[PDB]
Structures are given as structure tokens and as C-alpha cells.
Amino acid sequence: YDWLKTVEPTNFLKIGLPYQAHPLHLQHATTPPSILEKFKRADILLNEVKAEMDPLMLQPETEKKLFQILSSIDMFKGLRKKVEFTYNAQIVTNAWLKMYELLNTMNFNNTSQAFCNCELPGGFISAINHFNYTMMHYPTFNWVASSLYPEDHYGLYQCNPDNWLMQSPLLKKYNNGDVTIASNVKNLALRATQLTPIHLYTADGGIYNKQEELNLKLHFGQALTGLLSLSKGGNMILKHYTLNHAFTLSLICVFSHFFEELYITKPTSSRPTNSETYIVGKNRLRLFTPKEEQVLLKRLEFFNDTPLVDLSLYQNLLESVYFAVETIHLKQQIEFLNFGMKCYRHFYNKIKLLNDYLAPKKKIFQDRWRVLNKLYVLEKKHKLKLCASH
Ligand SMILES: Nc1ncnc2c1ncn2[C@@H]1O[C@H](C[C@@H](N)CC[C@H](N)C(=O)O)[C@@H](O)[C@H]1O
């Protein structure tokens, strides 16, 4: 009924974090500030709403109908193919859309000398290549990349060895691109810096109750690789999830010592029903000291989830991060999860009718996106060289 015909486009969610003027102190364990119980309450609540789907997953019939309902409520379903044909875009995965929305919204000072980590399909790379040649008009776009060795579904790794920094097992002798290994992280940055200035670092790494806890070491390494290679004034983009763990918040505290601007973003192209978030750092203020490099790389070498800094020294920032969690996860994500279950209860046996109801809105939402993130045809001379088809 009416609850389907009033659904409006979501908005790009962007929450500014304060930079910390105090000197960074990498910790060598401490008592948490009280605001961490607020974060723990948010993790319990979000997992409660996420748990509302467990009954349907037990029988393969209802599990199927659920993933169709979720498919049906994906308001951006047909957009990737529309963007690909109309504007000659390449590797138009959902990450392409997310990267393109980020570039059009965050107003970076430079997107020209890019290091994309945990990538493989050039969704982020292709989007930056597309954005640079059609919007920024850099004379040439030079980029390096890495990823855990396959997969390369579009032949971007195979057709551009010069640009990829990981190694196939034929060279086991050797950086396989695994950023959970401290030796690899330092090597990746070193090779990357051997691209002379690096202006844009991006990492889309990712592996439900413990999704953030299971990705902590991955997201730690993907951030360390950027912070070891991003030049001053450069920009950083990192894929994350719930950001409720104390280690995660301490990592954000580190970011906030090295960047002029720091934002927790949630693009509309990112599914409103998932916890995926993007930490955007702008205008790198300074580089690591040799000590900061050693402590942090050692924390990865022998990893445990003890906070990296004294969280009690970052109350302002932690309140802003909670406001992000509240806005992105506790409000938006929970509302859409609830919305998906309402659709399931009323349309599990009427998938076609729900798709009919929402087809007009899907065009409105996608037309809005294309109006907000303006696209232009990418000339063939600037297409990335690809080795495979789909
Ligand atoms: N430990 C790891 N080290 C490096 N890359 C990893 C690791 N774990 C997963 N990955 C890669 O991270 C990527 C995960 C995706 N979110 C990346 C998507 C990519 N940005 C795209 O355009 O489609 C995949 O390419 C994985 O192989």
C-alpha cells in the first residue's frame, strides 16, 4: 500500500570528524572511556535487527525468496549497465558507482596519482580513470594497484603488469598482495612509492555478528599500506563496516592525526541495507615518523585487538563517530532492513507485483543519481587496456 509509494531517494551520508591537534601517542592497554559502552550497545542493536532474517535462512526455499525480495528492493539494480553502455565505462561494478559518487562529492584536491589496494577488478581504478579523463582532464593518469593474487575478471591485471604490485605463485621464491602480512604491507608501499607522488590512495578490502572483528586485520593492513605511501596533501579512501570496535575507533584516531579533513561517508550507490562505510581522509597533513612506522607495522606483525591509542584522549572524535554510526547504521540501515522484512511478509509470494510497484521509483532514484554524479562519454583513447570480456 502507501508505504511503498512514499519511498524517497536516499541521500549521500557524510559525517565530519575533528582532526586532533595533540601529538599522537601510539599505545604500549588502558581503561576504555564510557562512550565505548554506547558503541557496544549499538553493535548489539544492529545485530538484533540483522538477526531478524535468521528464520528464513534455515530452509532453502524461504532463503531464496528472501534474496529475491532484497534484489527487488535494490533501487539501483539496472544502473551499472546503463552507465556502461551510455558512457563507454569499463568494469562498471557497484564499486565503480561508489567510487564515482565519492569523487563527485568529496571534492578532492587531486585524483591523478592513484594507488588502489585490495582491488583486482578495476571498479575503483576504472572509475578514477573515467573521472579523471572526462571531468578533471589530467594530461595523463598514472596509477599503481595491488590485490590478493586472484579475481581478474576483466583482464586488468593481465594486460598491465607494469601497474600491479603483487606477484603470482610462480615467483614464490614475493608479495602476494596479502595486506594482513606486515612484510607485505611495507613492501607494497615501497614499490608503490617507487609512482613518484601519490595523491590518491584507495582500499576496498573486505571478507555477520563479527564481520568487523573478522576484518580488523585486513582493514588495519589496508590502512597502513596507504599511510606508508600517501604523499603529503594526498587523499585516502578506505572501505570499512560498522566501526563499533575499540580497535577500529583507535585507528580512526590515528587517521585524525594525519589528515586535514576526515569523513565517514555512505554513498547512495553503497547498499543502504549493508554496514559498508568509507573513511575518507583529505589533504594529508604529515607523514609518519620512523617510530610511528615501526610501532604500527609491529602491531600488524603480532596482531591483537587492543586499541592503538588512549581512546579517552579522543572524546570529541568518538562522539562524531557515534553520530556517523547512529546516522548510517542505527537509522538508515535498520530502517531499510525493517523495510526489506516488511516487503518479504507482504510480497514473498508476489515478487512480480513488488517489482512492478517499485519500477517507477527505481527510475527516479537512478535518474537522480545520474543528475547528481554527472557522467560524460569516455573517449576510446583513454580506456583502460583490458584482457578479458565480462
Ligand atoms: N588480505 C587481503 N589482502 C589484499 N587484498 C585482499 C585481501 N582480502 C581480500 N582482498 C581483496 O579485496 C577485494 C575485495 C573487494 N571489495 C574489492 C572490489 C574492487 N574494488 C572492485 O572494483 O570490484 C578483492 O579483490 C579481494 O581479493
Largest beta-sheet details: 7 strands, mixed
- Helix-strand topology string: HEHHHHEHEHEHHEHEEHHH
Number of strands: 7
The number of helical runs is: 13
CATH level 3 topology? Rossmann fold
Distance between the termini: 39 Å
Using the coordinates above, name the CATH class: Alpha Beta
Number of domains: 1
Beta-strand content estimate: 5-15%
Report strand order across the widest sheet: 1-6-7-5-4-2-3
Radius of gyration, whole Å: 21 Å
CATH architecture: 3-Layer(aba) Sandwich
Question: Which features characterize this protein?
Answer:
alpha/beta, binds sinefungin, Rossmann fold, globular, 45% helix, Probable methyltransferase EP424R, methyltransferase cap1 activity, 7 strands, methyltransferase
Summarize this entry quickly:
The chain is of the alpha/beta class and 390 residues long.
Describe this protein's structure.
By secondary structure, the protein is an alpha/beta fold. The protein has one domain: Rossmann fold (3-Layer(aba) Sandwich), CATH 3.40.50. 45% of the residues lie in helices and 10% in strands. The chain contains 13 helices and seven strands. It has helices at 2-5, 35-51, 60-72, 79-87, 94-106, 123-136, 182-193, 211-214, 216-229, 246-255, 290-301, 315-347, 351-372, and strands spanning 13-17, 113-117, 142-145, 200-203, 235-240, 259-266, 277-284. The protein has a seven-stranded mixed β-sheet with strand order 1-6-7-5-4-2-3, with helices on both faces. β2 (113-117), α6 and β3 (142-145) form a beta-alpha-beta unit. α2 packs parallel to α12 (315-347), α5 crosses α6 and α7 crosses α11 (290-301). The longest helix has 33 residues, at 315-347. The relative contact order is 0.21. The structure holds sinefungin.
